[PDB]
């Protein structure tokens, strides 16, 4: 606080700015396929390269799953798993994210203006495939589609002037918007993903171990907002 | 699949990805129309 107070008086001791800390704990997402050495030799497609690619794809999938709806029990706590509240930025606990609980396409605008003016510049929408289909399906009371231009243009690149993005692992009636560069810190270890073909322990088998120490937390809880549309 | 493994717990075997074969059998589709040589000879248009 900046106390103007009385000009002609001893100046009072103003309260200092508060600080919060976000404990983003890292946890290993690991894959341990016990491939048989037979297939490695006998395949003429380099089955291990394909297996590592599949493990990388599933690692991206599990990374999205954890960073979206990861409960927190030795996994990255996704921003949706973090507790929610309908209060404003000044009223909310720093731990909790702001959520809009309507019961039409009105709430989205509310959500965008739940953010501060500065977050809107680099704000991004995160929408599930089902929820994106719902938003495109949210019709004017006239009946024509309010988000998408029409059935001809296609998927619109912006929802409220902000680049929309599609996360597959979001809930069926939950949408979010925020400056995730501020709002969510994905944390990887300097080791990164560490693949090790264990073709020694059970010989005749090549156990591909591949783990990455992933973490995720809601930094700057004022930079992410959630919108729980009706369950229908 | 990928396990959300922890520190005390051991790393159990994850299920490997399955591969599916698509068997697109080539089958013949044929036409065997018996035209009379008469119609071939006698049609003003090239009937064949």
């Amino acid at each position: 606080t900046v106390n103007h107070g009385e000009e002609g008086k001893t100046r009072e001791q103003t309260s200092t700015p508060q600080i919060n800390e976000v404990s983003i704990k890292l946890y290993p997402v690991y894959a341990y396929p016990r491939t048989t050495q037979e297939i490695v030799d006998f395949s003429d497609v380099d089955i291990l390269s394909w297996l590592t690619g599949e493990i990388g794809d599933t690692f991206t999938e599990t990374e999205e799953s954890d960073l979206v709806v990861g409960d927190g029990d030795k996994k990255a706590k996704g921003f949706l798993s973090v507790p929610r509240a309908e209060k404003n930025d000044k009223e909310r606990d720093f731990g909790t994210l702001q959520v809009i609980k309507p019961s039409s396409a009105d709430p989205l605008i509310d959500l965008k203006f739940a953010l501060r003016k500065k977050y809107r510049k680099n704000a991004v929408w995160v929408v599930n495939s089902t929820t994106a289909a719902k938003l495109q399906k949210v019709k004017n009371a006239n009946g024509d589609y309010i988000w998408r231009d029409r059935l001809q243009a296609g998927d619109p690149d912006t929802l409220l002037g902000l680049p929309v993005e599609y996360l597959e692992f979001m809930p069926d009636n939950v949408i979010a918007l925020g400056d995730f560069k501020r709002g969510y810190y994905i944390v990887d270890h300097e080791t990164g993903v560490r693949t090790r073909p264990d073709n020694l322990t059970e010989p005749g088998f090549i156990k591909i171990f591949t783990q990455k120490y992933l973490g995720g937390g809601v930094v700057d809880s004022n930079a992410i907002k959630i919108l729980e549309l009706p369950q229908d | 699949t990928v396990n959300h493994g922890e520190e005390g717990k051991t790393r159990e075997q994850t299920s490997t990805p399955q591969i599916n074969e698509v068997s697109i059998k080539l089958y013949p589709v044929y036409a065997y129309p018996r035209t009379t040589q008469e119609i071939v000879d006698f049609s003003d248009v090239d009937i064949l």
Partner: peptide, 5 residues
Amino acid sequence: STGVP
């Protein structure tokens, strides 16, 4: 990956 098809 095993001998299973």
